[PDB]
RNA sequence: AUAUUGGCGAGAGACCGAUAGCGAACAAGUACAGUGAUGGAAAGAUGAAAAGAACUUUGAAAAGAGAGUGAAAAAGUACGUGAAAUUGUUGAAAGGGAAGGGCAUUUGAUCAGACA
RNA sequence: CGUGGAGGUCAGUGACGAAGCCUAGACCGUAAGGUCGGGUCGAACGGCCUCUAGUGCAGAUCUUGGUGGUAGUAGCAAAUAUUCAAAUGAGAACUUUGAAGACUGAAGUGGGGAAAGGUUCCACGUCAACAGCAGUUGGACGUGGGUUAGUCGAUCCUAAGAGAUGGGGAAGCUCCGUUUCAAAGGCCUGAUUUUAUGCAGGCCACCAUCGAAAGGGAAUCCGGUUAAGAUUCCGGAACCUGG
RNA sequence: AAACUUUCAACAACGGAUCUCUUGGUUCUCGCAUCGAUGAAGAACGCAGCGAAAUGCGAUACGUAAUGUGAAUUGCAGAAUUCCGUGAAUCAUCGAAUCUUUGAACGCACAUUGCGCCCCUUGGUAUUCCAGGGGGCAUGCCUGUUUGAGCGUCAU
C-alpha cells in the first residue's frame, strides 16, 4: 500500500539524547510511544523502495520470433530422442509422429477416449501422470497451487466434436487445434519435445 | 427492604425511570386496591428507581406482601 | 515551581461531554465541541486528519438503517406481504 | 462531586455495571478464548475521563 | 429470610464453587502474565522526557 | 405462548383482555423470580406479550389504511417508503410526457427494422 | 475442472464458507451414507442426518459398534451416538463424537417431509 | 549532473507523477466487455446492423 | 466509448505468512496517554476427542510423589516444535597479575581403514 | 555456493517419521557451504535444467524483543516510639481485645464541607497479586447491601460576558451587531354561550435565549432510628405557595 | 587438593527464534447504483433464565409478525413430541410492525434528563388550579385558499 507504514506521525529528536536519530513515535501512554517508524529498518515501517504496480508484467516478443519458436518446437516433437529425453515414456511407441485416424474427433465419452489412447500407446504415460500426484513444496500450497502433476500427451484435432469434451477430465492430457498451437503447451518449461498425438485431419492441415 | 416493611407499612418497589411520583401513586393505588399517602423515590446507582411507598394506616404491608407472594 | 507544585492546582474542568459525539470534548468557556463543532451544523470533517476520518466515518457504529438498504434494493424495494 | 448532575450519574451506573470479572461459564464454552476480562478497571489506577 | 444466596443461581448453571476456585485462580494468574509483559516493555521507553532540564550550568 | 395464526381472528376487546392478562402473568413470574435461581418460562411470556402487541398494532394499521383507500393524500406513514431519491424523481407518466411536435414526429417517422441482404 | 465464474475454487473462500456456515446449512453438510439394505430399498446414496436414527460406525476405533443417534451436534460438526461411550475416570460416561461422513444409517427415522425428501430425490415410499 | 557524451534528454517528471499513472491492466478486461456490448446491441436491436 | 485508493456483490494472484501483510488474523481504531486537536499498542498454534488427571499419601494450603487419561505429559492450560544470549546440577580438564589465537608434538578422550 | 517463490523432470523422498533443532561424532569442497550417523521431533520436503526477487549481516549513538555483569551490592535513615499478657491462626515486631507508655495540643494527627474522584461507604468470605519487610489486616481481592426532601441546594433572576432574529458583510466555512433603519406583540368591557367580535379600545412601545450548587432568592425544627442513610425515613410540633 | 573462574556435553530452567500452519491483509479484474425531515451517518443509555466485552436489538429490546427449510439450541439449566406438524431453530428469507434519550434537530433551552403553549378526553366540586393520557407548536422558499394594510391608484 502507498501508506504501508506512513499512518504514523513521527519526528526525530535530533541529537543530544543517548538514542538513535530515526523518526520516533512521539506522545506517551501506550507501549508504542517511543518506537521508530518511517524506515526500512524499524519494526512497523515501510519497506525499501516499496514494490509498485507499474512493473513490466507482460513483455513483447517479435511476432516472427514467436512463429519461429513454435515451428521449432513442432519440429522437435517428431524426433524420438527428444520426447523420450524430455521425460515422456515414448519407449514402446511404434511411430514417433503417432498419427491416429480422424475418428478421434467424434469421440464423446472419456471411457471411450482413454481406451483410444491406451490402444495407440499412452497406457504407460497416463499411469505416469496419475502415479505422480504429489504435494507442492513450501508456501505456494496455500495460494491455490496445492497439487502438482506431470504433463501428459497432447492430442491435436482439426475440428472438434467433443474431443476436448472427452479429454478435459483426464489428468495430463491436453487438447489443441492446429491454429493456436501454444508454445507453453508444446515445450512446457523451456524443455523441447512433447508427446503430441496428431489426428490426420490436423496432420494434413499442418502442411 | 424487608425490615422497612414491618416497621411502618412501607412497601419497597423498584419502579421505572420515567415515573414521576404520580403514576407510581396511581398504579400502586390500582393494582392492589390500596390507598397511599406518601411516596419517596430515589435513584439507586444501578440506574434503577426505588420507591419507598407508604401504605395508609387502614392497611398492613405484611398482608399485601403475603397477597403478592414475596412474603 | 512550574512542574509538580503547579500540577496540584488542576481541578476545575474545561471540557465536558458533548451531546452529538459523546466524548469529553465540549468546551465550556465558549461552548463548542472540538471533535465536531456542536452549535455548528456540519460535523468537523477534515482531510489532514485522515486517520480521524476512520474513527468517526460511516460503517463504524450500529447503522440501524443503513445496513438494510443494500438488502432492500436487491428485492426491488417491493411491498405487500410475503406469501400465503 | 457530591453535587453531581444526571449526565454523570447516568454514566457511573454503567461504570459500576462494567466492573466485575468475566462470568465463569464463559470459559467453558466451545470456541471461547476469552481468558480474563481486559476492559476491567478499578478506581486506583485508570481514571475514566468524565 | 432468604432462600436465594449468591451461590444459588451459579450452582445450577454451569460452574460450581469448587471449580469456581479453579477458575478464579486461573484469571489472577493470567492477569499477572498480562501485567508482567507490559512492565517488561514500558520500563525501557519511559525515561524519554522530551522537555528535560539537565539542571547544572554554573 | 400464544400463536398469531389463531390470534389474528379474535376481536379487539378480547385482544385487550388478553394483553391485560399477560401483563399480570409477567408480573407474577417476575415476583417468583426473586426466590428462585432460574426461570426460563418468562421468555414465553414476553414473546406472548409482543405477539399480541404486534397483532393489535397491525390490525389498527390496516383499519386506517383501508379507510384511506384511494383518498388523495394518505398519511406519511402509510405511503410506500422508498428512498429519498425515488420519491423526489419523476413518475412513469411525467417522464413519458412528450410535446406534440416530438409525438407527431415519433409517429410520423419512427424506427424501422430491416436487414442487409440483396 | 469447473467451468463457471459463479463458484470459487479458492481455499480461504471455501474454508470460511465452511467454518462460518449457518445452522440451517450445516444440516446438509452433516450427511451420512445409507446401507446396502437401505440403498437398494430406497434409491438414495446419502441423506441429511436427523436425530434418533439407527447408525453404524465404519471408520475409526469404534468400527462395527451400532447405535442410535442421540443428539446431532452441528456446532462441533459431529453427532453423539448412544452405545458409543467413553468411560471417564470419574466413573461417569461421555458419548464419543463421530463425524457423519464416517457413519452409515441402517434403521431410519421416517416422517413426513422425509417421505417427500426421498421422493423428490427419486426413491420409493 | 551533465556527466558524459550522452544525449541531452528531457524527462517531464518534476511533478507528482506517481499519483497519476494509469497502467492499463484493463486491456483484456474491457475487450471482452466490448465484445458483449457488441452482442447486447446485436440482440436488443434484433435484425438491424 | 470515459473515470472510480469510497459503498455493495463477485473472481483470481510467479505477493506477504504474524517483528511480514492494513494500525488491527484475537472482545481494534478496542485497551492506553493527553484538557484537546489527535496520538495508538502488545496479543494466533494442547490433543483426534477434554478423554483437563478419579483414588492414595505428605503438607495448614500453593503444590509434591505415586496411580490414571493419552499413540505422546520429551502435548498438563504457564499447553506443537522449544534456537541463542543467560543459569543450576553432575562429569572431563586447566589455572603464580587477564582469557582467546598460529606452527609442531608428547599425554588423555574419541573416530578409523580392512589388509576378512 | 546459498535463500523465498514459478515452469519441467526425477512415474524423487516421507507416519516403518517429512522440515526444524542439538552434537570438542564422521566425510567432501582451499573456501562460499554440501553429505551421513545419533537424540529430540511430528507433516511436509528436496536434486537437476530453467525463470523470478522485498535474497545472504557484526556493526548504522541501528529498530523490536530477550538476558547479562555490575549485585544479594546501592540501599529500604525527615515527621520524637514503642512495650507486655491473652484471642483466632499453619504462622504474628505488623490483626484484634485489655493493660501500660506516648503524641497531635482547638490556625489539631478533631468534627463538617467546596472543586475533583466514583461506589473506595458497610457487612460476609479470602491472600495468587498490590500495600517497595510482613500479614489472618486493608482504600486490594469475590458476592450482595446502601443515598428516601413541598422547605437544604439546582430549577427562577441579573453582572462581567456569550449568542440567534430584522438586516448588512463575505466566493465561502461563516462575520458584524443585540435594539438597531422589522409592519416584531398581549387583554378587560358593551360583544356579555354565534366569546365570534363590527366598532367599542386602549395602556410605555417595551422585547428571543443562556450566564452564579460562594451574589439575589417563599417556607422546618427537635427527639429517636441504620451494618451503611438525614434539616429527607419514624413520632410529635410548625409553616410558605398555588387553588 | 576442594572451593571458585573458564571451556564443553548431556539433563533441567529463563527465553520465544526457526520449521510447519491461517476464517486475515494487499494488489488486479468484472458487474450493479441504493443514505437522509416517512428523520440519516454518528452518539448516550438500556435489553438475555444465568454476560464484562464483540455481535444483535429497542420498554414489542441477542428480539415481534410473514415466508422458506423441517427437528433443534448446547456451557449449564429447561420445556419434548409442538416430531406423518400451522412446526424445533443464537437458522435462513425478509416485503409488516415497534423503534428509548438524542443527533441536519425541529416549541424555548442545555455543564439543567429544565421550562412553558394550543387542542381532545380522565379524575380531583372545577371554563381559569393541579395531575394522568393522545396528537400537535422551527426557520428559508414555491403554488393556492383566507384575512387584511397602503390620498399607490381606478370606477361609482
Ligand atoms: Zn462532539
Curated annotation (Swiss-Prot), chain A:
PTMs per UniProt: N-terminally acetylated by acetyltransferase NatA.
Cell location: Cytoplasm; Nucleus
Record keyword Cytoplasm present: yes
Keyword Methyltransferase: no
Keywords: Acetylation, Cytoplasm, Methylation, Nucleus, Ribonucleoprotein, Ribosomal protein, RNA-binding
Gene Ontology BP, a term: cytoplasmic translation
Coiled-coil regions listed in the entry: none
Cellular component, GO, one term: cytosol
Omega-N-methylarginine sites (modified residues): 43
Single GO molecular function: RNA binding
Functional summary from the UniProt entry: Component of the ribosome, a large ribonucleoprotein complex responsible for the synthesis of proteins in the cell. The small ribosomal subunit (SSU) binds messenger RNAs (mRNAs) and translates the encoded message by selecting cognate aminoacyl-transfer RNA (tRNA) molecules. The large subunit (LSU) contains the ribosomal catalytic site termed the peptidyl transferase center (PTC), which catalyzes the formation of peptide bonds, thereby polymerizing the amino acids delivered by tRNAs into a polypeptide chain.
Subunit structure: Component of the large ribosomal subunit (LSU). Mature yeast ribosomes consist of a small (40S) and a large (60S) subunit. The 40S small subunit contains 1 molecule of ribosomal RNA (18S rRNA) and 33 different proteins (encoded by 57 genes). The large 60S subunit contains 3 rRNA molecules (25S, 5.8S and 5S rRNA) and 46 different proteins (encoded by 81 genes). uL4 is associated with the polypeptide exit tunnel. uL4 interacts with its chaperone ACL4 and the nuclear import receptor KAP104.
Gene designation per UniProt: RPL4A
Curated annotation (Swiss-Prot), chain C:
HAMAP family per UniProt: Ribosomal_eL37
Binding residues annotated for Zn(2+), in chain numbering: 18, 21, 33, 36
Pfam families in the record: Ribosomal_L37e (PF01907)
GO molecular function: RNA binding; rRNA binding; structural constituent of ribosome; zinc ion binding
Top-level taxon of the source organism: Eukaryota
Cofactor notes: Binds 1 zinc ion per subunit.
Name under which the protein is recorded: Large ribosomal subunit protein eL37A
Biological processes annotated in GO: cleavage in ITS2 between 5.8S rRNA and LSU-rRNA of tricistronic rRNA transcript (SSU-rRNA, 5.8S rRNA, LSU-rRNA); cytoplasmic translation
Subcellular location(s) of the protein: Cytoplasm
Zinc finger residue ranges, C4-type: 18-36
Entry keyword set: Cytoplasm, Metal-binding, Ribonucleoprotein, Ribosomal protein, RNA-binding, rRNA-binding, Zinc, Zinc-finger
Lineage: Eukaryota, Fungi, Dikarya, Ascomycota, Saccharomycotina
Subunit relationships: Component of the large ribosomal subunit (LSU). Mature yeast ribosomes consist of a small (40S) and a large (60S) subunit. The 40S small subunit contains 1 molecule of ribosomal RNA (18S rRNA) and 33 different proteins (encoded by 57 genes). The large 60S subunit contains 3 rRNA molecules (25S, 5.8S and 5S rRNA) and 46 different proteins (encoded by 81 genes).
Required cofactor names: Zn(2+)
Misc remark: Present with 21800 molecules/cell in log phase SD medium.
GO cellular component: cytosol; cytosolic large ribosomal subunit; preribosome, large subunit precursor
Database matches in NCBIfam families: PRK04179.1 (NF003214)
Gene name tied to this protein: RPL37A
Similarity field: Belongs to the eukaryotic ribosomal protein eL37 family.
From Swiss-Prot, chain G:
Cytoplasm recorded as keyword: yes
The organism's place on the tree of life at top rank: Eukaryota
Cellular component, GO, one term: cytosol
Subcellular location: Cytoplasm
Keywords: Cytoplasm, Ribonucleoprotein, Ribosomal protein
GO terms (BP aspect): cytoplasmic translation; ribosomal large subunit biogenesis
Signal peptide: none
Ribosomal protein as UniProt keyword: yes
Pfam families assigned: KOW (PF00467), Ribosomal_L26 (PF16906)
Note: There are 2 genes for uL24 in yeast.
PANTHER family reported for this sequence: 60S RIBOSOMAL PROTEIN L26 FAMILY MEMBER (PTHR11143)
Subunit structure, interactors included: Component of the large ribosomal subunit (LSU). Mature yeast ribosomes consist of a small (40S) and a large (60S) subunit. The 40S small subunit contains 1 molecule of ribosomal RNA (18S rRNA) and 33 different proteins (encoded by 57 genes). The large 60S subunit contains 3 rRNA molecules (25S, 5.8S and 5S rRNA) and 46 different proteins (encoded by 81 genes).
Record family assignment: Belongs to the universal ribosomal protein uL24 family.
Function description: Component of the ribosome, a large ribonucleoprotein complex responsible for the synthesis of proteins in the cell. The small ribosomal subunit (SSU) binds messenger RNAs (mRNAs) and translates the encoded message by selecting cognate aminoacyl-transfer RNA (tRNA) molecules. The large subunit (LSU) contains the ribosomal catalytic site termed the peptidyl transferase center (PTC), which catalyzes the formation of peptide bonds, thereby polymerizing the amino acids delivered by tRNAs into a polypeptide chain.
The name this protein goes by in its record: Large ribosomal subunit protein uL24A
Swiss-Prot record, chain H:
Keyword check for Nucleotide-binding: no
Swiss-Prot/TrEMBL GO biological process terms: cytoplasmic translation
Origin: domain of life: Eukaryota
GO molecular-function term, one example from the UniProt record: RNA binding
Major place of residence: cytoplasm
GO cellular component, one term: cytosol
Subcellular location: Cytoplasm
Keyword terms: Cytoplasm, Phosphoprotein, Ribonucleoprotein, Ribosomal protein
Subunit structure: Component of the large ribosomal subunit (LSU). Mature yeast ribosomes consist of a small (40S) and a large (60S) subunit. The 40S small subunit contains 1 molecule of ribosomal RNA (18S rRNA) and 33 different proteins (encoded by 57 genes). The large 60S subunit contains 3 rRNA molecules (25S, 5.8S and 5S rRNA) and 46 different proteins (encoded by 81 genes).
Free-text function comment from the UniProt entry: Component of the ribosome, a large ribonucleoprotein complex responsible for the synthesis of proteins in the cell. The small ribosomal subunit (SSU) binds messenger RNAs (mRNAs) and translates the encoded message by selecting cognate aminoacyl-transfer RNA (tRNA) molecules. The large subunit (LSU) contains the ribosomal catalytic site termed the peptidyl transferase center (PTC), which catalyzes the formation of peptide bonds, thereby polymerizing the amino acids delivered by tRNAs into a polypeptide chain.
Family affiliation: Belongs to the eukaryotic ribosomal protein eL13 family.
Additional remark text: Present with 133000 molecules/cell in log phase SD medium.
Protein name, per record: Large ribosomal subunit protein eL13A
